Amino acid sequence: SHMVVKVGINGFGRIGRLAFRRIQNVEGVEVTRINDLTDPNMLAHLLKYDTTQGRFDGTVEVKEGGFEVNGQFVKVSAEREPANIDWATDGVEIVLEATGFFASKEKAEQHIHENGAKKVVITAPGGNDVKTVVFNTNHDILDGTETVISGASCTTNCLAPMAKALQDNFGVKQGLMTTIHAYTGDQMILDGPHRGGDLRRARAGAANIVPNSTGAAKAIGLVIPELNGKLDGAAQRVPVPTGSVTELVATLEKDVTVEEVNAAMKAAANDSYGYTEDPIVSSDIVGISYGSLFDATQTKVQTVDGNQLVKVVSWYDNEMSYTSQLVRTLEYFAKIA
Amino acid sequence: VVKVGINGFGRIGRLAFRRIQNVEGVEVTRINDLTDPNMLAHLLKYDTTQGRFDGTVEVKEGGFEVNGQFVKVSAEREPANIDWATDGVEIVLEATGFFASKEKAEQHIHENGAKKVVITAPGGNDVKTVVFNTNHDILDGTETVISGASCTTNCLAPMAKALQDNFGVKQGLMTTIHAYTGDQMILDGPHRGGDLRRARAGAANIVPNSTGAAKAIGLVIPELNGKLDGAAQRVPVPTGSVTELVATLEKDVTVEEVNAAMKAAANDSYGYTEDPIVSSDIVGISYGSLFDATQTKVQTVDGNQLVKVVSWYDNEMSYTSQLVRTLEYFAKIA
Amino acid sequence: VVKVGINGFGRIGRLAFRRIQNVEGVEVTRINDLTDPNMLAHLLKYDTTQGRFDGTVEVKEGGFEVNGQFVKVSAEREPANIDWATDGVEIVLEATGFFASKEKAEQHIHENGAKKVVITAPGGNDVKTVVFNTNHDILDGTETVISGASCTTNCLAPMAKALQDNFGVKQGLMTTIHAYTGDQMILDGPHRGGDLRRARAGAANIVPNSTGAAKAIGLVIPELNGKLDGAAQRVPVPTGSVTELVATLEKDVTVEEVNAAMKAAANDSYGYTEDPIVSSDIVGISYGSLFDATQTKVQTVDGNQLVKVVSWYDNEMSYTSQLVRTLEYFAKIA
Amino acid sequence: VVKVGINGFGRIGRLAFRRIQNVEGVEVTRINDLTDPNMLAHLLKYDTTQGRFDGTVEVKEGGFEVNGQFVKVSAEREPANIDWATDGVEIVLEATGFFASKEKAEQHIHENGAKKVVITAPGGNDVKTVVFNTNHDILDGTETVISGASCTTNCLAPMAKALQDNFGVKQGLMTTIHAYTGDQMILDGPHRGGDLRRARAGAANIVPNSTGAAKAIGLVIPELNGKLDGAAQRVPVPTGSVTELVATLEKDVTVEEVNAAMKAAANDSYGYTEDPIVSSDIVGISYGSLFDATQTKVQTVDGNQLVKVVSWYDNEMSYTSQLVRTLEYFAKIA
Ligand SMILES: NC(=O)c1ccc[n+]([C@@H]2O[C@H](COP(=O)([O-])OP(=O)(O)OC[C@H]3O[C@@H](n4cnc5c(N)ncnc54)[C@H](O)[C@@H]3O)[C@@H](O)[C@H]2O)c1
Ligand SMILES: NC(=O)c1ccc[n+]([C@@H]2O[C@H](COP(=O)([O-])OP(=O)(O)OC[C@H]3O[C@@H](n4cnc5c(N)ncnc54)[C@H](O)[C@@H]3O)[C@@H](O)[C@H]2O)c1
Ligand SMILES: [Mg+2]
Ligand SMILES: [Mg+2]
């Protein structure tokens, strides 16, 4: 609990580097080994300088075998195959699989061998033989015997605590979700052939409102079984480089008022789910450690006839909120065995 | 040929002038703003979002010359003090944002003033509110002050009408993901109107903001009065917006029925598309609302349905197209 | 009427096609690109920076119907197997990138192929570089393959040439304040190219970057070889750029002389303006370069002068427009 | 502990306040602006470009509490009417933009007023204009009104001073690629100041604009008087800027010498770097100026040299860091 889990990161892209950054400020968790195929000098620079998350809090120098991050050495390997990483050499109990390739059960568990690691957390959905965990919503399902788990998506970690609070208090019949989302790496900087064939993600990301699909509301059942098949949604990608907001319009079993809804969210608040009545904007949530931040100023309960539509809304940094939730799950999972 | 005056040569005003060049039977002979003719002539010629002007503009003393024809410019702060009649001006496009009630808009009507006024915004409940090809039939021609509604109203109305006529609307909640506007601050600072969100850098944030378009839809479609509410998320595009509506309907429907209904309701004001477009693709369109079949949802859970419908609009040109159709028609029954 | 083939339907190819619709006496009868035609058709119809396609585009078997006329759209990987002569194609705009040398580009030349080729890339010593209305007099017509230079070269060249011809250039440094481009990451990440600056979010940063358009000006203006160097600052506009040249000249000058000289050098490729414009005003212009007299500076300190001289260009449509001109002309000689 | 007034709680005002929390012996006891406490308290807590406030801010009657300690807020439009003396205020940060001359700034000095004024801007040619760690030695403590110069002057001066000291400057032209600021319109509209370029949408354009910093360098470095001129290109980032200087020198140099000379001159105000950084990397820095060795060019052509040196600055936090340093020093010698 104050015990410091030694952590490996595989793939030092956006999620890896931010996971690293987050881990400096949540100790009782420590990265001793990074693995990635790109030039360590390219990697050091991108750890140091970050457009949206700011300059690194400290110092980063390239040394033989790794980095000195504020004095402390950290090993950087470039082993292509997960089977070939001697994690146990550097005390590494658990691995954050963040490449984007090794995202099934049988691929990720190649990290497990006598010189490898005990456990693995994947940064995508794993399917349905790999448990899916949003911290402080459904992390109770972990018994400790599991070899590989998933941290869900950025959108799922925002929606989950907000949806869970609606279910436990009032009961959700059905709901539709709209995420107003920062542009992401899967969009073209300028109009051009998207190698996925998506005609919308082919368009200039920082110059357009771009509608896009998302499976977060449809696959919410993996995290909250009571809402399986009850939620659907979509996204509007807009020109901010990070920071997002999720609106849920739902029909509930119980009658409610705005005040009841907000107070129920305030009472559900914890390290993962924040609360605020400050009329904030997206730039204010960049770098937060909440997985989701409910905003009471945007709540609506529309009673027309007997019938009620309820609008809820929660902010999230699709980068750092997600990262923070992932580090929370990576800590807890390593501390059961 | 009806002679039109524009009070407020801003985004809506300047673009109304641009459209009026292609409307035979309507002509602008007076502009009133707060600035010199050279500022206004420059801003007509060059437009960041809507492109270079189609023609010639040259500055003169007391006005400017658009393709040879002189148009008078004045900088009178007060509506009552504008001598519209001097220039032959019968109808005024009130496009400043400051005289958007019946009382205030009527100051334009006096001796040597104008006969009639079209507000480019909600004008309160005691002004008639016209979305062209939805409720422009309600005009007899004896009105002094009418409203052309808001931009978001002109998007939502034909879409919500189509849902009501075909299926019946129980209730509904609207989100408009909307371009930033001139009432937002370019960088964080004191908002004169007290808004803590519009005080923030408009091109660097997703900014929640309130909107009355759904709440006041009763003024355009009486049968929907009290049934719709909503809000906005202002985002970093300089123009171009989209309206999502989530609704419970009286009749059970499918995605295909809903889209076909919309296509059938299509006209000059209400577009239909199945192309998966983005906001830049609607900049400068002449529809007041462009329905997008690619974003329609119909979610059935335990026999109950939620219906999602989405229409694009250029908050600038889409509104302005509607405004000028409503002007053209209002002039011809005056 | 010159029948044209476009090998590579990326930003350039697509705009070349769009341009060619309006400068007729030049026509596109065959497009060849390995991308799914439905993606290509969609990108032709809708363009973020250059607006909607002027016309209609529908995907048909083997090609597109663009406003009535059918255009064949093949996906030949190899240049020697495109049967250009089956669609009357005289001249090929090589815009793929893969076939940028002479011997690669001239595989388009065979009995069932084309007669001539214009690469969009910079040639390899034995391929002539051509800015239209600057050095297109060097083309005798016997050449098989030529280059149309870069976007920046097409902006700089007519401005530098007028400096040389009127005054004489000793040396110079160039800075381009440039739209972000497709070789920049949308968000911070590892980049093919290795550039730690192009690895950064392009629409959220000022990003210094290297250019050789000044260093390679010798190829277009022999008198300026070795005399100009430069660099760029990529900034958050999706298209539109501006080129600043600070030069020592052989002759003493005034700001008025400099400006009237540029005005005298004006033509279809080199525009001249005295309006205080901004980048959005040059989006989609057909000039290769647009001299801005309002930014001219001549700083006399002691006996000595530094002359600052500035030009706008749509790094997209300006370069494209210059490339369709070169393409038209090179075809009409044989 | 000297007690300080801020007039204008804007970008510079609020960041100055922020920096003063960590400066022992300086303390803000009064803020004056044109709006209520809740607006100002909100804009302090939440900052788009500079992040959340480091502390607690709570609104009260007549002011707000910052980590417990109360700060009075008034809304007095005229400097002559502000009773600074009531709150112990001796020195005023004149940060509104509207009282930026010796004469206008002096209106804070009266019975019940303040003792001394620091303008957060150029204040004309009869006022001591200080760039900290370049010429703050000129302050004796008897001055009533001083200027902290402009953002761009605080960037340019240490770079130009090292060039003078080590090698001697003949003449020089400056281009600053600059963030947009609050004097630009968020969308195309009449600019109150009459500037036809600042009228344009600032987050959607490259906007040329004038700047007096280069010409006024004589106030800070007398030996460079009349030798420097420049201009700006305002571009779509909300903060962060960079200054390119092209100079002919008296001594011949190499790239290596030039960079070594900058690193020698390095201090708390003048940073030195060799990392290929971009504008977001300098947001929030405490350096007034940050030299970038990677962009140094020395071009030699026929014996003759043009030298290019480039320094970064957060027009917001870099200037403010410089301003508060000058404020801290001025207050100690008063
Ligand atoms: N831009 C949109 O998206 C949009 C859409 C629909 C409706 N509207 C409405 O249209 C109106 C104008 O909006 P806009 O976006 O064009 O704003 P804008 O700021 O571009 O235009 C306002 C213009 O009015 C001028 N002005 C202000 N006070 C004046 C006075 N007393 N006399 C004369 N001129 C004066 C200003 O100088 C400016 O040119 C508002 O009511 C707004 O709600 C705007
Ligand atoms: N922002 C920059 O990058 C920057 C850098 C260096 C210097 N400056 C200079 O600093 C000054 C302020 O710039 P800013 O960007 O902070 O502007 P800003 O618009 O953010 O702030 C101006 C503030 O002054 C207030 N104000 C206006 N008139 C007033 C009055 N009569 N009394 C009291 N308050 C009044 C406004 O409400 C606002 O809060 C200007 O002189 C500017 O040139 C700005
Ligand atoms: Mg007409
Ligand atoms: Mg203090």
Author numbering:
A (entry chain D): -1 to 335
B (entry chain C), C (entry chain B), D (entry chain A): 2 to 335
Quote what the paper states about this structure.
GAPDH plays a key role in glycolysis and gluconeogenesis by catalyzing the reversible oxidative phosphorylation of D-glyceraldehyde 3-phosphate (D-G3H) to the energy-rich intermediate glyceraldehyde 1,3-bisphosphate (1,3-BPG). Recent studies suggest that GBS GAPDH is a major virulence factor and a potential vaccine candidate. GBS GAPDH exists as a tetramer. Each GAPDH subunit is composed of two domains, and consists of 13 helices and 2 β-sheets of 9 and 8 strands.
In the mixed apo/holo-form (referred to as mixed-holo) NAD+ is bound in two subunits while the other two subunits are in the apo-state. In the mixed-holo complex NAD+ was bound in one subunit of each dimer- subunit A of the AB dimer and subunit C of the CD dimer contained NAD+, while B and D subunits remained in the apo-state. Presence of a mixed-holo form was observed previously in the crystal structure of GAPDH from rabbit muscle. In the mixed-holo structure electron density was sufficiently continuous for fitting all residues in each subunit including the apo-subunits. This structure further illustrates the effects of conformational changes induced by NAD+ binding in the individual subunits. The rmsd between subunits with and without NAD+ are 1.2–1.3 Å. In comparison, the rmsd between the pairs of apo-subunits (0.33 Å) or holo-subunits (0.2 Å) in this structure is much lower. The effect of NAD+ binding was most pronounced in the conformational variations among the two sets of subunits in the mixed-holo complex. The difference in distance between Cys152 SG and His179 NE arises from the movement of the side chains of both residues upon NAD+ binding. Thus in the mixed-holo complex, the corresponding distance in the NAD+-bound subunits (A and C) is 3.5 Å while the distances are 3.8 and 4.0 Å in the other two subunits (NAD-free-subunits).
